[PDB]
Design a protein around this nucleic acid. Sequence first.
DNA 1: GACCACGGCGCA
DNA 2: TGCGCCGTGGTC
Length: 538
Amino acid sequence: EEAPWPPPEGAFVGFVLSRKEPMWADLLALAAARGGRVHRAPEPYKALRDLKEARGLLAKDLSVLALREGLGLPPGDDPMLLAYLLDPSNTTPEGVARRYGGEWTEEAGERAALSERLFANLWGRLEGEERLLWLYREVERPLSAVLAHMEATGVRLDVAYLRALSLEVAEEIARLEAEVFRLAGHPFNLNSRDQLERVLFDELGLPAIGKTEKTGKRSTSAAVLEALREAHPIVEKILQYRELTKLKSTYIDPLPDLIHPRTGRLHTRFNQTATATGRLSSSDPNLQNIPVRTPLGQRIRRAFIAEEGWLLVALDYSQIELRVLAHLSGDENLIRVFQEGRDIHTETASWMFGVPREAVDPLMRRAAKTINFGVLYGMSAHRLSQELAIPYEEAQAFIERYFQSFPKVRAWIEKTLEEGRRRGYVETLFGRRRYVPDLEARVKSVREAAERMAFNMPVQGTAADLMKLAMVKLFPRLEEMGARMLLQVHDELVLEAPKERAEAVARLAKEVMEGVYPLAVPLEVEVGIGEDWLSAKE
DNA sequence: GACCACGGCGCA
DNA sequence: TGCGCCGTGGTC
Ligand SMILES: Nc1ncnc2c1ncn2[C@H]1CC[C@@H](COP(=O)(O)OP(=O)(O)OP(=O)(O)O)O1
Ligand SMILES: [Mg+2]
Ligand code: NA
Ligand code: NA
Ligand code: NA
Ligand code: NA
């Protein structure tokens, strides 16, 4: 059972970290298991040099830490990836363990033994599941290596810039805070939604609109505040206060404190088994939700910069989820729009909601986007009218004139739900699965909620599969050009390239992304270059 | 000190 | 539709 370090090749690794973040963790223990024997490493760090590959639960995490120490240790087989492909609700080692025959403990040796056992059991369950096997070998397993390099590389942050911006925003916050209190006739904690509720609906005469989900309090959400924007001067200042405090507390203040001492850069984690649809997630810190939609947000984007002598290259799949819907549904009108190379939102703004596409004003185009997104998420005419500043009836029509112009989308949604009810799951173009039991619920509200989750997954998940595949293909090509892949934001990639190669890099990555997997419609990629994330965007 | 539920909101 | 993080108001 107990055998001296080192282990034979192909052994499963087990390791304990002082904390969950690979880039910040002390490696406390390092074990390995193979053929019914466990090898525990006398000194974890030195023991790392003996390994040729990290095979086991949470492989990437160990690879990231290895890369941190200047070791080129790649992640290989990971039972978590197998489990997640079988059922995307398999997101943690704790859960996967109890489910497939072990216990996730806090000891390296037991973790190595667990990894071996779980892999054997899980690999057998993936026999016959050829499409999931293809996903594992061709996408998830290789992807884990790409992600490990991204995590270890990190991205550069203009700290002094954010420090200065912080002091600016702090001053503006105090003005709004002072005004709000003037209008309230007294100070209170403006960050407390409970105290705000009292002030708005009880102390001021403002009418409550909706209520909160769990506790049933009168909501003070943006949707509610926006509707009361001209019911009282205090509202506008509260909306602005919300924006500034959100951005300051979430990005401006925390980010500078997260710079790594060795790298001088910011290192997120790209979670590979975290979502029900097949998307990645980002945490510690989350870099897939850096602001950009507001002025202040854009000034925050500017903080993410290229290394000196380098440029950022930002690549973005144009309307990918819509293109994927065109393919999956086979709707002629939708397919023709993309094949003719037309702006789908502009076309959507003419095909319905009047005419003609020579064209529509910009405010009309966002109207079309709202509809499209709405269809994507199964948004009711209610929330659509509230999202469109138009009477409820005006929204109902807009939704109908949509399914008139793109009939096969309707047929596709109905077909997807029917098959989901029979099989108990839905799938992406590549066969990635999400089980959706509640399609058979006897409570309409629950059932319908489940339906929206169900038919959306094939779209969101196919777009995720495509991006993942693209990253897998793109990565080796960048390596050979001396370029870096830094971040992924669902439909977008951010790279780093030497100034002199930035053009060549952008051209190559663009073409690699557009040709990732030919569909019934072309994939168009928009690319931008700049010294910071904002100026690199379009 | 850590952790929780909630409402709220940042991004795709 | 899918995430992860914030402060509040709390518990332990
Ligand atoms: N405000 C919002 N609300 C909900 N979902 C949103 C969103 N913004 C984006 N998404 C979702 C849906 C799409 C995706 C981001 O795509 P783009 O925002 O770039 O819209 P695209 O289709 O490319 O039209 P373009 O104007 O760019 O031509 O994330
Ligand atoms: Mg876009
Ligand atoms: Na991992
Ligand atoms: Na139904
Ligand atoms: Na989606
Ligand atoms: Na090569």
